[model samples]
Target: HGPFQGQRQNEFDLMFVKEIFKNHNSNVVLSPFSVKILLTLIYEASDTSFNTKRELSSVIQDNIDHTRSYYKQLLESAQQDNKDYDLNIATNFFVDDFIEVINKYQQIANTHYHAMLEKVSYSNPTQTAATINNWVSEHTNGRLREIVTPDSLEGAVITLVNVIYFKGLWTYPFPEVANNVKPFYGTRGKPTNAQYMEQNGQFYYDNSADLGAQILRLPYRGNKLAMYFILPNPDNTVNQVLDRINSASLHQALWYMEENEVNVTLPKFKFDFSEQLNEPLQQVGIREIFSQNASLPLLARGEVRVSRIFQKAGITINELGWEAYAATEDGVQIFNANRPFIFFIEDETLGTMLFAGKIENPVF
Candidate 1:
């Protein structure tokens, strides 16, 4: 049991996903892990206002001490044991030249969150935007090259950023073949051509009756990280299956999954997604951060409100393996993914969700 073992965080994660899905019915990708890190940074900076702290804490679903310890453990271990896969994470605070962040706050962010602090001038918003995008490109290995624009940075005092890049080699790779065109039945449209990768092997799988879906676990080379695919029954939609899922159900699926030889067919997909998180964050009860009430006293002394939170993310999967880059400016899996399905990448050891999304249409 790790962070996701508890009831609150998992509940929040699903709620957040549900909120995002309300606006999207197509291919989608996001990192709740990245979003949580962003929220934690905001939480650490907002030290003066009790309501601000309480609102953030309510969504964070844990006390500050435990949250810090868990992230510290997660961040530190990633650096040491990443030989099997390329996992990179970077977080930074870009502060306006006039404001001074508290030293105690800086120390905690640096030591616990492994974040860096930089003093920047927002007078030249274009230059600042380019600088941030360059940092993102370097950290994500160019999977997500650009996110911030000069217009998006208007009136920003302090901007926080997080980037994660993961390229994992599968323990069992689908052999490369030509002419992979296959029909993918989509929710919004009729069948369309999709690049299908076919493989037959022993996988951790279960045709879960409780979930009304098929679950499959595909492990990366290290086995510490994995992708879980949840494909709904023929009659059921992804939303219906999602409605029945919770932390306990997810764990039970994992617990009951057995090694079975199955034929797996998956679609090859690649796409980039960017989202303004203000609406979803508010919808999920994180209202104080964006309004006049955003009390980030430890971050600065004056009236400091976050104008916007933008996240850009991308994922590409092929017969060779998987490559994904997500940067929070935030801000999965499949058995065939032949149709609409839900999937997530998780740190198996920590039970932390790294990335999650659904593919309503995999035509691209």
Candidate 2:
């Protein structure tokens, strides 16, 4: 017997996704499209039981269509000359191709769920990273060459593509010693002070109970990237904040933010975390994917199963810069993940880092 059955399992899945978004809200911006894409991927990857092949196919097909439509909207909004902008043109075309590829991959996975199971080898990461890098380059017509490495793999069959670039100046630059402050809260509200870099300047922010917490957006060095801090109200109410968060609610809160100048103070804390998302994923509702009893009608040719799954993400922030990326894929879904990189910063006062970490197998 499973821990959750039927509709309760679905609710648990939704809740898990909400928790992931809530946890990430304090650090980075999670676009609606990104969230949607991520959830779709998670669901697809988590479906281990071949019993749901037909259902999985329907779900994947729907997501593919939706993702394609969203990409079109993004392209239209950019309003650039597609002919001269070879990179832009290629990106649009690649989205179309990727959708088709995903459809095919899903079908294969459904048919051969058993054969797809395997552990990630040392060479797998590099090969997968390279494949992704090449696809990104071709899609962007060489304008967006990403850097991939074995270390980038972090887990089995990882792939990532990032289109980020940032440039900004801090509102108040800190002196060298200002970085040495007391303890600060890292993940899980662990009370340990970091240097807590101090800065005094008029900044733009908004705080309200309707919005759930105080949101402070800081820009990094090039102004292309940004770090957002969502400090829970009452200091000990992270759970409350998380409980209240959802895609729609979060969108509304961000929209409700009224631009106003205020004196800003923040810590210069730096921390990093890399952990398997299996428990969290199981906590959400798609536990069967990680079990041998689970069957993947996609990515498998015969009586095979997904032997391992991996994911790694890392981020570091000081006073000046940031970088981050995430990749996930199955056996035949390899891509090279190395090259130059780009990141964004919405403001210029806070630094961000590319977070790196991975899992070797799915944790049940």
Candidate 3:
């Protein structure tokens, strides 16, 4: 079965994504699907109170067995090579080697997730921190070199990490010859010079009168993947666009799009964001896992409380595409993202997000 077969995709994952974004004023990049896999594995190994399990399952929104099976296929697909893109997805569980780790948890981590189970000495926090950070750098193609520090590793017994990295060539690239230095207005202040990747092409697009934004689809070589840019009106703001967007609206926006000629001016940007997920996890009823009444006794007989949860993500957009076409097949004007806006990279087949972010300052 496909990922969205009989799925109640109310964009519950996006619900949590915005919660994390609400705490920050600048840019953000997050992988909700990757995190869902990590947390679901944690739930599988957890033997918690009935109330807590129920609460966790409530957000899961589907039968646990089916979800697990679906992720198994997803993990398998990402490991295979495709000419259209290069994607690396990894999930690992790190335990204190000094402790007698459970054999079953180790086996599941290896076989099911196809991830490493590194047994490290937490006594040397610096070394342990390096082990995790170093692995993150290698896995993410060096986009994010450091995700954990010695201070952050002080009171953790077991740590689980989820990573998603994707690189794709656009079906129609914005040529380096077409790139130019242009003005990109900031959220609350002055404007700065940002490089704009210009191209004239026909794309699936639409203008939403109610939301007051134009939507455009920029496809990777593979028909399965693409980045959907939500270009808010000059009068509107990024936060306002995000505030108005949800599952229904996103579906409607894509549903209304039709092929039309257009001039696209997209800013070349590199967005990287990593954060400790303690506060936001609790925002979603994941409280018991981080407390004294910890319930993951199956994996650890001794006192083992999950002190923190973390996520790191990165994406860089530049010139990648094909030949240009005539403009305005249906009078669709230039859908230029010369200012602050939100964008998403998702699989059209699965209909789930791989990564999502907002660019407040393209200079960064």
Each model's TM-score, in the order given?
0.89, 0.49, 0.89
User: Deviation in angstroms for 183 in model 2?
Assistant: 5.0
The best-first sequence of candidates by lDDT reads 1, 3, 2
Ranking by TM-score: 1, 3, 2
Better of 1 and 2 by lDDT: 1
lDDT by residue for model 1 (75-177), tens: 6655445567887667777778888877887888888877776777899898889888998898788888887889988988777777677787777888777
Residue range with the least summed lDDT across 10 consecutive positions in model 3: 321-330
lDDT of 1 at 339: 77
Off by over 4 Å in 1: 1-9, 48-50, 58-63, 78-81, 324-335
Error of 2 at 88 (Å): 18
- CA lDDT, every prediction? 0.75, 0.35, 0.72
User: Better model by lDDT, 1 or 3?
Assistant: 1
**How many backbone clashes are present in model 3?**
5
For candidate 2, the per-residue lDDT at 257 reads: 48
Backbone clash numbers for all candidates listed: 3, 83, 5
